Amino acid sequence: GAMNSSNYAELFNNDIKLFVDDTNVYRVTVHKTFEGNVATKAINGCIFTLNPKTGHLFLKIIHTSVWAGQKRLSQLAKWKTAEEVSALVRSLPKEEQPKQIIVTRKAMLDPLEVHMLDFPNIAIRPTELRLPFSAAMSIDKLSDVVMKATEPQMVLFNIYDDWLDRISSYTAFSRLTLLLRALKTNEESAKMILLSDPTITIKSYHLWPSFTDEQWITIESQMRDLILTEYGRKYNV
Amino acid sequence: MNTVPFTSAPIEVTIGIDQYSFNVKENQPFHGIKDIPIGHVHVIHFQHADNSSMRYGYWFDCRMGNFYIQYDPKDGLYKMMEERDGAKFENIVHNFKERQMMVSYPKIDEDDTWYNLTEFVQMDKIRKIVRKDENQFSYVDSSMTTVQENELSDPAHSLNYTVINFKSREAIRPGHEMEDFLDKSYYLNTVMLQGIFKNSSNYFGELQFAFLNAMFFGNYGSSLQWHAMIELICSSATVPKHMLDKLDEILYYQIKTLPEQYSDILLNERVWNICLYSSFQKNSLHNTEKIMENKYPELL
């Protein structure tokens, strides 16, 4: 059934699984028309498909061309997400195919279940976790590849950089969720925390800076503070 | 007009014949039902006074043979049997009619209710849903499961309704996932109507039979099949006009006949709200929408 805090260790066991987040698939700016009506203009989106154990991110870039002349785009976006995840699973060798796909939004369940009828042993599950994967587009190198695309593209990242050399996938997932929650809550302040010290850089083959273990503790503390500061600001508490 | 004699009534029982019902007392001189209209299937059904467990009954057609009821004190139920001796049967009926020991099928001359509920129901199709080829009549009860309920257990005693599953490879063509899931026209018209039922009459027959087994036996799987067959039409954008017109008539008489006090157990809120107010055919069921809104507005 649904994946929660009771069964959190399940994410880091040896059963291949993927999180799928569809928040950034269909993206628009809303604007006034010359006649004073309102119109949307789509921008490039992406499917966020993540193995939480390995850090392997399957970033499917959704180019604005896929919406051309289509109707009910918010509905179509769910089915296009399901179509692309189904295509990714079919492209993977058998021993790499997931045993579970966890969707971040319940509206993905029927589209993904219907696209995956050919895979009755792949469980499609919701989660009670509130996961900040919508903030993926706050990671400069992911945002950059999405906005530069002139065509549908799949790009492969490790969202943990080289962290698994030093920490477990439980701790790497904890770190990722805290960074993405901070970027979602106050993007400017989060990026300032990550880049404030010019001596610590992002390797060409990485997404995040090259923090030592002691520096990750400091960054993580500054991220927690940011989230707590913003909660105080929101609720005047 | 045809007759179903009873050997006797040794236990107190509520007897149904189609939409009618009568209480028989323990060892009352009851010897059966006369003046049963030729031209329709019928159902004769039972609920024991001392054990309301197992509603059970027999679908039969008087054109197919001479049928009587005899209580079996071993299996504890009223059994239908065929009498193969024509002149013995005529002689038993005659004696019981002369001594006025039979109830008359109480049909009002203005009253098309039973025809309206069984228009498409035929005994040969019932005998394919209920598999017992040694009898010309079909036994159904409260607890009999469907082939579909048994997939999700004795297959001999099952209701072989046509499996309908919206999230099945049968319902969804590869490459048309969104199209086929949101618009069931493929599933209804090519797979079910052209493919399995051959025509809308056979589809409406099974729908009407499912309803009657839900209502007369409280059979849960039957109720599921009746709703599934309604939702399959209502969730299709492309349905022949004659089919939508006939469906409205079919549903109207079903909703008209349903005991008011069984609406909470026999009617699925989700399916009806979806069929009447959200589906492609939300505007195609005027008669059904009007009776539902006037008789069961609490469901909607």
PDB file of all heavy atoms in Angstrom, chain A residues 72 75-77 79 90 109-111 113-118, chain B residues 166-172 174-179 181-182:
ATOM      1  N   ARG A  72      -6.301  19.852 -22.308  1.00  0.00           N
ATOM      2  CA  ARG A  72      -6.308  19.419 -20.878  1.00  0.00           C
ATOM      3  C   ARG A  72      -4.886  19.023 -20.455  1.00  0.00           C
ATOM      4  O   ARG A  72      -4.651  17.821 -20.126  1.00  0.00           O
ATOM      5  CB  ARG A  72      -7.296  18.266 -20.684  1.00  0.00           C
ATOM      6  CG  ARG A  72      -8.710  18.594 -21.161  1.00  0.00           C
ATOM      7  CD  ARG A  72      -9.717  17.484 -20.896  1.00  0.00           C
ATOM      8  NE  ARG A  72      -9.557  16.949 -19.543  1.00  0.00           N
ATOM      9  CZ  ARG A  72      -9.863  17.581 -18.402  1.00  0.00           C
ATOM     10  NH1 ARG A  72     -10.376  18.802 -18.409  1.00  0.00           N
ATOM     11  NH2 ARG A  72      -9.642  16.983 -17.243  1.00  0.00           N
ATOM     12  N   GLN A  75      -3.955  17.108 -17.071  1.00  0.00           N
ATOM     13  CA  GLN A  75      -4.327  15.676 -17.201  1.00  0.00           C
ATOM     14  C   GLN A  75      -3.314  14.973 -18.107  1.00  0.00           C
ATOM     15  O   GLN A  75      -2.772  13.930 -17.745  1.00  0.00           O
ATOM     16  CB  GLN A  75      -5.765  15.564 -17.700  1.00  0.00           C
ATOM     17  CG  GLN A  75      -6.247  14.151 -17.996  1.00  0.00           C
ATOM     18  CD  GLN A  75      -7.624  14.143 -18.628  1.00  0.00           C
ATOM     19  OE1 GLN A  75      -8.620  14.010 -17.935  1.00  0.00           O
ATOM     20  NE2 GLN A  75      -7.683  14.286 -19.954  1.00  0.00           N
ATOM     21  N   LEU A  76      -3.030  15.533 -19.272  1.00  0.00           N
ATOM     22  CA  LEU A  76      -2.113  14.853 -20.198  1.00  0.00           C
ATOM     23  C   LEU A  76      -0.765  14.640 -19.510  1.00  0.00           C
ATOM     24  O   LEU A  76      -0.134  13.605 -19.796  1.00  0.00           O
ATOM     25  CB  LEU A  76      -1.936  15.683 -21.476  1.00  0.00           C
ATOM     26  CG  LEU A  76      -0.953  15.075 -22.471  1.00  0.00           C
ATOM     27  CD1 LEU A  76      -1.378  13.693 -22.934  1.00  0.00           C
ATOM     28  CD2 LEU A  76      -0.799  15.987 -23.663  1.00  0.00           C
ATOM     29  N   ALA A  77      -0.290  15.618 -18.750  1.00  0.00           N
ATOM     30  CA  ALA A  77       1.030  15.591 -18.062  1.00  0.00           C
ATOM     31  C   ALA A  77       1.183  14.348 -17.197  1.00  0.00           C
ATOM     32  O   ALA A  77       2.309  13.766 -17.197  1.00  0.00           O
ATOM     33  CB  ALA A  77       1.252  16.850 -17.296  1.00  0.00           C
ATOM     34  N   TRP A  79      -0.309  11.381 -17.719  1.00  0.00           N
ATOM     35  CA  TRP A  79      -0.245  10.246 -18.657  1.00  0.00           C
ATOM     36  C   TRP A  79       1.082  10.244 -19.435  1.00  0.00           C
ATOM     37  O   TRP A  79       1.660   9.128 -19.628  1.00  0.00           O
ATOM     38  CB  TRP A  79      -1.475  10.253 -19.549  1.00  0.00           C
ATOM     39  CG  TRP A  79      -2.706   9.898 -18.781  1.00  0.00           C
ATOM     40  CD1 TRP A  79      -3.560  10.757 -18.151  1.00  0.00           C
ATOM     41  CD2 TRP A  79      -3.197   8.568 -18.521  1.00  0.00           C
ATOM     42  NE1 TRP A  79      -4.548  10.048 -17.509  1.00  0.00           N
ATOM     43  CE2 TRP A  79      -4.359   8.709 -17.727  1.00  0.00           C
ATOM     44  CE3 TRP A  79      -2.749   7.274 -18.821  1.00  0.00           C
ATOM     45  CZ2 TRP A  79      -5.082   7.605 -17.274  1.00  0.00           C
ATOM     46  CZ3 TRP A  79      -3.462   6.184 -18.365  1.00  0.00           C
ATOM     47  CH2 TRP A  79      -4.613   6.351 -17.593  1.00  0.00           C
ATOM     48  N   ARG A  90      11.082  -0.262 -19.442  1.00  0.00           N
ATOM     49  CA  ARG A  90      11.208  -1.246 -20.560  1.00  0.00           C
ATOM     50  C   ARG A  90      12.623  -1.165 -21.138  1.00  0.00           C
ATOM     51  O   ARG A  90      13.127  -2.214 -21.559  1.00  0.00           O
ATOM     52  CB  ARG A  90      10.210  -1.010 -21.688  1.00  0.00           C
ATOM     53  CG  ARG A  90       8.796  -1.324 -21.268  1.00  0.00           C
ATOM     54  CD  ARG A  90       7.766  -0.897 -22.285  1.00  0.00           C
ATOM     55  NE  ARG A  90       6.603  -0.592 -21.476  1.00  0.00           N
ATOM     56  CZ  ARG A  90       5.653  -1.456 -21.131  1.00  0.00           C
ATOM     57  NH1 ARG A  90       5.679  -2.709 -21.556  1.00  0.00           N
ATOM     58  NH2 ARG A  90       4.652  -1.047 -20.367  1.00  0.00           N
ATOM     59  N   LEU A 109      -1.213   7.537  -9.604  1.00  0.00           N
ATOM     60  CA  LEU A 109      -1.367   6.082  -9.395  1.00  0.00           C
ATOM     61  C   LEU A 109      -2.038   5.433 -10.594  1.00  0.00           C
ATOM     62  O   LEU A 109      -1.516   4.415 -11.021  1.00  0.00           O
ATOM     63  CB  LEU A 109      -2.125   5.771  -8.088  1.00  0.00           C
ATOM     64  CG  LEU A 109      -1.395   6.030  -6.778  1.00  0.00           C
ATOM     65  CD1 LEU A 109      -2.386   5.966  -5.604  1.00  0.00           C
ATOM     66  CD2 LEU A 109      -0.251   5.052  -6.511  1.00  0.00           C
ATOM     67  N   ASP A 110      -3.201   5.918 -11.057  1.00  0.00           N
ATOM     68  CA  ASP A 110      -3.967   5.209 -12.115  1.00  0.00           C
ATOM     69  C   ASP A 110      -3.193   5.318 -13.427  1.00  0.00           C
ATOM     70  O   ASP A 110      -3.027   4.340 -14.113  1.00  0.00           O
ATOM     71  CB  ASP A 110      -5.397   5.725 -12.295  1.00  0.00           C
ATOM     72  CG  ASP A 110      -6.352   5.166 -11.237  1.00  0.00           C
ATOM     73  OD1 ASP A 110      -5.959   4.238 -10.505  1.00  0.00           O
ATOM     74  OD2 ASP A 110      -7.475   5.660 -11.165  1.00  0.00           O
ATOM     75  N   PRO A 111      -2.664   6.487 -13.798  1.00  0.00           N
ATOM     76  CA  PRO A 111      -1.926   6.577 -15.059  1.00  0.00           C
ATOM     77  C   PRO A 111      -0.747   5.592 -15.064  1.00  0.00           C
ATOM     78  O   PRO A 111      -0.551   4.889 -16.057  1.00  0.00           O
ATOM     79  CB  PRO A 111      -1.482   8.029 -15.082  1.00  0.00           C
ATOM     80  CG  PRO A 111      -2.535   8.754 -14.297  1.00  0.00           C
ATOM     81  CD  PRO A 111      -2.857   7.802 -13.169  1.00  0.00           C
ATOM     82  N   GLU A 113      -0.257   2.858 -13.112  1.00  0.00           N
ATOM     83  CA  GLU A 113      -0.777   1.462 -13.077  1.00  0.00           C
ATOM     84  C   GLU A 113      -1.210   1.005 -14.487  1.00  0.00           C
ATOM     85  O   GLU A 113      -0.925  -0.145 -14.931  1.00  0.00           O
ATOM     86  CB  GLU A 113      -1.955   1.396 -12.085  1.00  0.00           C
ATOM     87  CG  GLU A 113      -2.686   0.066 -12.223  1.00  0.00           C
ATOM     88  CD  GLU A 113      -3.675  -0.293 -11.104  1.00  0.00           C
ATOM     89  OE1 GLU A 113      -3.995   0.591 -10.282  1.00  0.00           O
ATOM     90  OE2 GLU A 113      -4.147  -1.464 -11.095  1.00  0.00           O
ATOM     91  N   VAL A 114      -1.924   1.851 -15.220  1.00  0.00           N
ATOM     92  CA  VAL A 114      -2.444   1.484 -16.561  1.00  0.00           C
ATOM     93  C   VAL A 114      -1.284   1.327 -17.557  1.00  0.00           C
ATOM     94  O   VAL A 114      -1.323   0.393 -18.331  1.00  0.00           O
ATOM     95  CB  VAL A 114      -3.460   2.524 -17.047  1.00  0.00           C
ATOM     96  CG1 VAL A 114      -3.755   2.339 -18.525  1.00  0.00           C
ATOM     97  CG2 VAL A 114      -4.716   2.486 -16.187  1.00  0.00           C
ATOM     98  N   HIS A 115      -0.245   2.152 -17.479  1.00  0.00           N
ATOM     99  CA  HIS A 115       0.949   2.065 -18.376  1.00  0.00           C
ATOM    100  C   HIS A 115       1.820   0.847 -18.042  1.00  0.00           C
ATOM    101  O   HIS A 115       2.618   0.431 -18.873  1.00  0.00           O
ATOM    102  CB  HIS A 115       1.771   3.352 -18.285  1.00  0.00           C
ATOM    103  CG  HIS A 115       1.363   4.310 -19.337  1.00  0.00           C
ATOM    104  ND1 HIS A 115       1.821   4.200 -20.624  1.00  0.00           N
ATOM    105  CD2 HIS A 115       0.485   5.335 -19.324  1.00  0.00           C
ATOM    106  CE1 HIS A 115       1.261   5.138 -21.370  1.00  0.00           C
ATOM    107  NE2 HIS A 115       0.475   5.889 -20.577  1.00  0.00           N
ATOM    108  N   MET A 116       1.664   0.275 -16.859  1.00  0.00           N
ATOM    109  CA  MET A 116       2.570  -0.757 -16.350  1.00  0.00           C
ATOM    110  C   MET A 116       1.790  -2.069 -16.244  1.00  0.00           C
ATOM    111  O   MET A 116       2.310  -2.976 -15.590  1.00  0.00           O
ATOM    112  CB  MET A 116       3.131  -0.325 -14.990  1.00  0.00           C
ATOM    113  CG  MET A 116       3.977   0.951 -15.061  1.00  0.00           C
ATOM    114  SD  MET A 116       5.509   0.639 -15.944  1.00  0.00           S
ATOM    115  CE  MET A 116       6.376  -0.297 -14.691  1.00  0.00           C
ATOM    116  N   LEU A 117       0.634  -2.213 -16.929  1.00  0.00           N
ATOM    117  CA  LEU A 117      -0.150  -3.486 -16.855  1.00  0.00           C
ATOM    118  C   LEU A 117       0.709  -4.698 -17.264  1.00  0.00           C
ATOM    119  O   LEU A 117       0.485  -5.770 -16.717  1.00  0.00           O
ATOM    120  CB  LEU A 117      -1.417  -3.405 -17.707  1.00  0.00           C
ATOM    121  CG  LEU A 117      -2.472  -2.453 -17.167  1.00  0.00           C
ATOM    122  CD1 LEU A 117      -3.550  -2.208 -18.220  1.00  0.00           C
ATOM    123  CD2 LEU A 117      -3.057  -2.960 -15.859  1.00  0.00           C
ATOM    124  N   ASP A 118       1.652  -4.507 -18.176  1.00  0.00           N
ATOM    125  CA  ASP A 118       2.591  -5.529 -18.704  1.00  0.00           C
ATOM    126  C   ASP A 118       3.581  -5.946 -17.613  1.00  0.00           C
ATOM    127  O   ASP A 118       4.298  -6.910 -17.852  1.00  0.00           O
ATOM    128  CB  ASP A 118       3.392  -4.981 -19.888  1.00  0.00           C
ATOM    129  CG  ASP A 118       2.549  -4.787 -21.130  1.00  0.00           C
ATOM    130  OD1 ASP A 118       1.442  -5.362 -21.168  1.00  0.00           O
ATOM    131  OD2 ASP A 118       2.988  -4.040 -22.030  1.00  0.00           O
TER     132      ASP A 118
ATOM    133  N   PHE B 166     -11.585  -2.506 -15.543  1.00  0.00           N
ATOM    134  CA  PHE B 166     -11.151  -1.247 -16.210  1.00  0.00           C
ATOM    135  C   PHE B 166      -9.616  -1.160 -16.258  1.00  0.00           C
ATOM    136  O   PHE B 166      -9.132  -0.474 -17.160  1.00  0.00           O
ATOM    137  CB  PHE B 166     -11.807  -0.017 -15.575  1.00  0.00           C
ATOM    138  CG  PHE B 166     -13.316  -0.057 -15.647  1.00  0.00           C
ATOM    139  CD1 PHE B 166     -14.090   0.218 -14.529  1.00  0.00           C
ATOM    140  CD2 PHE B 166     -13.957  -0.477 -16.797  1.00  0.00           C
ATOM    141  CE1 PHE B 166     -15.473   0.086 -14.577  1.00  0.00           C
ATOM    142  CE2 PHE B 166     -15.345  -0.550 -16.865  1.00  0.00           C
ATOM    143  CZ  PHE B 166     -16.097  -0.287 -15.745  1.00  0.00           C
ATOM    144  N   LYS B 167      -8.904  -1.823 -15.357  1.00  0.00           N
ATOM    145  CA  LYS B 167      -7.419  -1.774 -15.302  1.00  0.00           C
ATOM    146  C   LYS B 167      -6.873  -3.157 -15.631  1.00  0.00           C
ATOM    147  O   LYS B 167      -6.205  -3.769 -14.777  1.00  0.00           O
ATOM    148  CB  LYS B 167      -6.966  -1.169 -13.974  1.00  0.00           C
ATOM    149  CG  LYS B 167      -7.535   0.221 -13.731  1.00  0.00           C
ATOM    150  CD  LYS B 167      -6.811   1.042 -12.678  1.00  0.00           C
ATOM    151  CE  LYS B 167      -7.097   0.566 -11.270  1.00  0.00           C
ATOM    152  NZ  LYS B 167      -6.527   1.499 -10.278  1.00  0.00           N
ATOM    153  N   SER B 168      -7.213  -3.631 -16.828  1.00  0.00           N
ATOM    154  CA  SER B 168      -6.825  -4.948 -17.379  1.00  0.00           C
ATOM    155  C   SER B 168      -6.326  -4.734 -18.802  1.00  0.00           C
ATOM    156  O   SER B 168      -6.805  -3.786 -19.465  1.00  0.00           O
ATOM    157  CB  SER B 168      -7.957  -5.925 -17.381  1.00  0.00           C
ATOM    158  OG  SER B 168      -8.929  -5.529 -18.333  1.00  0.00           O
ATOM    159  N   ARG B 169      -5.411  -5.600 -19.258  1.00  0.00           N
ATOM    160  CA  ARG B 169      -4.936  -5.562 -20.654  1.00  0.00           C
ATOM    161  C   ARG B 169      -6.150  -5.705 -21.571  1.00  0.00           C
ATOM    162  O   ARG B 169      -6.081  -5.170 -22.672  1.00  0.00           O
ATOM    163  CB  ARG B 169      -3.888  -6.640 -20.956  1.00  0.00           C
ATOM    164  CG  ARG B 169      -3.494  -6.736 -22.426  1.00  0.00           C
ATOM    165  CD  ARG B 169      -3.084  -5.415 -23.074  1.00  0.00           C
ATOM    166  NE  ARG B 169      -1.816  -4.933 -22.527  1.00  0.00           N
ATOM    167  CZ  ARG B 169      -1.565  -3.711 -22.038  1.00  0.00           C
ATOM    168  NH1 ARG B 169      -2.496  -2.768 -21.995  1.00  0.00           N
ATOM    169  NH2 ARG B 169      -0.351  -3.443 -21.599  1.00  0.00           N
ATOM    170  N   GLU B 170      -7.220  -6.404 -21.163  1.00  0.00           N
ATOM    171  CA  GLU B 170      -8.404  -6.516 -22.063  1.00  0.00           C
ATOM    172  C   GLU B 170      -9.000  -5.117 -22.299  1.00  0.00           C
ATOM    173  O   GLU B 170      -9.469  -4.842 -23.417  1.00  0.00           O
ATOM    174  CB  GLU B 170      -9.475  -7.462 -21.530  1.00  0.00           C
ATOM    175  CG  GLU B 170      -9.091  -8.919 -21.593  1.00  0.00           C
ATOM    176  CD  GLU B 170      -7.979  -9.348 -20.648  1.00  0.00           C
ATOM    177  OE1 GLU B 170      -7.820  -8.739 -19.555  1.00  0.00           O
ATOM    178  OE2 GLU B 170      -7.252 -10.285 -21.020  1.00  0.00           O
ATOM    179  N   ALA B 171      -9.017  -4.250 -21.293  1.00  0.00           N
ATOM    180  CA  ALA B 171      -9.719  -2.954 -21.378  1.00  0.00           C
ATOM    181  C   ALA B 171      -8.839  -1.878 -22.045  1.00  0.00           C
ATOM    182  O   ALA B 171      -9.393  -0.871 -22.452  1.00  0.00           O
ATOM    183  CB  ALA B 171     -10.191  -2.525 -20.021  1.00  0.00           C
ATOM    184  N   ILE B 172      -7.522  -2.088 -22.159  1.00  0.00           N
ATOM    185  CA  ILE B 172      -6.547  -1.032 -22.528  1.00  0.00           C
ATOM    186  C   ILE B 172      -5.668  -1.554 -23.658  1.00  0.00           C
ATOM    187  O   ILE B 172      -4.936  -2.515 -23.451  1.00  0.00           O
ATOM    188  CB  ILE B 172      -5.677  -0.623 -21.326  1.00  0.00           C
ATOM    189  CG1 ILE B 172      -6.502  -0.190 -20.102  1.00  0.00           C
ATOM    190  CG2 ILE B 172      -4.724   0.472 -21.766  1.00  0.00           C
ATOM    191  CD1 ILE B 172      -7.327   1.067 -20.311  1.00  0.00           C
ATOM    192  N   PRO B 174      -2.388  -1.466 -25.696  1.00  0.00           N
ATOM    193  CA  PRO B 174      -1.044  -0.893 -25.726  1.00  0.00           C
ATOM    194  C   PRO B 174      -1.012   0.291 -26.691  1.00  0.00           C
ATOM    195  O   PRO B 174      -1.582   0.207 -27.763  1.00  0.00           O
ATOM    196  CB  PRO B 174      -0.188  -2.052 -26.242  1.00  0.00           C
ATOM    197  CG  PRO B 174      -0.918  -3.281 -25.769  1.00  0.00           C
ATOM    198  CD  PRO B 174      -2.392  -2.930 -25.855  1.00  0.00           C
ATOM    199  N   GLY B 175      -0.416   1.396 -26.264  1.00  0.00           N
ATOM    200  CA  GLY B 175      -0.320   2.635 -27.055  1.00  0.00           C
ATOM    201  C   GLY B 175      -1.531   3.537 -26.936  1.00  0.00           C
ATOM    202  O   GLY B 175      -1.431   4.665 -27.391  1.00  0.00           O
ATOM    203  N   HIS B 176      -2.664   3.070 -26.384  1.00  0.00           N
ATOM    204  CA  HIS B 176      -3.881   3.907 -26.223  1.00  0.00           C
ATOM    205  C   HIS B 176      -4.294   3.948 -24.756  1.00  0.00           C
ATOM    206  O   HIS B 176      -5.515   4.087 -24.517  1.00  0.00           O
ATOM    207  CB  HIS B 176      -5.055   3.353 -27.038  1.00  0.00           C
ATOM    208  CG  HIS B 176      -4.773   3.122 -28.484  1.00  0.00           C
ATOM    209  ND1 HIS B 176      -5.464   3.771 -29.490  1.00  0.00           N
ATOM    210  CD2 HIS B 176      -3.943   2.251 -29.093  1.00  0.00           C
ATOM    211  CE1 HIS B 176      -5.033   3.340 -30.662  1.00  0.00           C
ATOM    212  NE2 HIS B 176      -4.118   2.395 -30.444  1.00  0.00           N
ATOM    213  N   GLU B 177      -3.324   3.901 -23.841  1.00  0.00           N
ATOM    214  CA  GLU B 177      -3.547   3.838 -22.369  1.00  0.00           C
ATOM    215  C   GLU B 177      -4.497   4.959 -21.917  1.00  0.00           C
ATOM    216  O   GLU B 177      -5.488   4.650 -21.271  1.00  0.00           O
ATOM    217  CB  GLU B 177      -2.203   3.923 -21.626  1.00  0.00           C
ATOM    218  CG  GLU B 177      -1.361   2.664 -21.728  1.00  0.00           C
ATOM    219  CD  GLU B 177      -0.507   2.555 -22.975  1.00  0.00           C
ATOM    220  OE1 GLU B 177      -0.511   3.523 -23.759  1.00  0.00           O
ATOM    221  OE2 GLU B 177       0.137   1.499 -23.159  1.00  0.00           O
ATOM    222  N   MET B 178      -4.140   6.236 -22.097  1.00  0.00           N
ATOM    223  CA  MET B 178      -4.961   7.382 -21.630  1.00  0.00           C
ATOM    224  C   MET B 178      -6.327   7.360 -22.326  1.00  0.00           C
ATOM    225  O   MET B 178      -7.357   7.598 -21.645  1.00  0.00           O
ATOM    226  CB  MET B 178      -4.303   8.729 -21.954  1.00  0.00           C
ATOM    227  CG  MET B 178      -5.022   9.877 -21.340  1.00  0.00           C
ATOM    228  SD  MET B 178      -4.214  11.420 -21.759  1.00  0.00           S
ATOM    229  CE  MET B 178      -4.855  12.461 -20.465  1.00  0.00           C
ATOM    230  N   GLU B 179      -6.301   7.199 -23.642  1.00  0.00           N
ATOM    231  CA  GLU B 179      -7.512   7.211 -24.493  1.00  0.00           C
ATOM    232  C   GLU B 179      -8.503   6.167 -23.963  1.00  0.00           C
ATOM    233  O   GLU B 179      -9.675   6.536 -23.723  1.00  0.00           O
ATOM    234  CB  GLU B 179      -7.132   6.902 -25.948  1.00  0.00           C
ATOM    235  CG  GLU B 179      -8.334   6.685 -26.861  1.00  0.00           C
ATOM    236  CD  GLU B 179      -8.045   6.285 -28.307  1.00  0.00           C
ATOM    237  OE1 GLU B 179      -6.910   5.856 -28.634  1.00  0.00           O
ATOM    238  OE2 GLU B 179      -8.993   6.346 -29.097  1.00  0.00           O
ATOM    239  N   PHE B 181      -8.499   4.400 -21.106  1.00  0.00           N
ATOM    240  CA  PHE B 181      -8.822   4.487 -19.662  1.00  0.00           C
ATOM    241  C   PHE B 181      -9.904   5.559 -19.467  1.00  0.00           C
ATOM    242  O   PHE B 181     -10.838   5.349 -18.677  1.00  0.00           O
ATOM    243  CB  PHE B 181      -7.589   4.768 -18.799  1.00  0.00           C
ATOM    244  CG  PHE B 181      -7.941   4.677 -17.332  1.00  0.00           C
ATOM    245  CD1 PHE B 181      -8.310   3.460 -16.791  1.00  0.00           C
ATOM    246  CD2 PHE B 181      -7.997   5.808 -16.531  1.00  0.00           C
ATOM    247  CE1 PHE B 181      -8.671   3.367 -15.453  1.00  0.00           C
ATOM    248  CE2 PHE B 181      -8.333   5.704 -15.186  1.00  0.00           C
ATOM    249  CZ  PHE B 181      -8.685   4.491 -14.662  1.00  0.00           C
ATOM    250  N   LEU B 182      -9.812   6.673 -20.184  1.00  0.00           N
ATOM    251  CA  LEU B 182     -10.721   7.842 -19.994  1.00  0.00           C
ATOM    252  C   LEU B 182     -11.988   7.663 -20.823  1.00  0.00           C
ATOM    253  O   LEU B 182     -13.014   8.177 -20.392  1.00  0.00           O
ATOM    254  CB  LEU B 182     -10.013   9.154 -20.348  1.00  0.00           C
ATOM    255  CG  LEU B 182      -8.911   9.604 -19.383  1.00  0.00           C
ATOM    256  CD1 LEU B 182      -8.380  10.971 -19.794  1.00  0.00           C
ATOM    257  CD2 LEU B 182      -9.389   9.634 -17.942  1.00  0.00           C
TER     258      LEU B 182
END
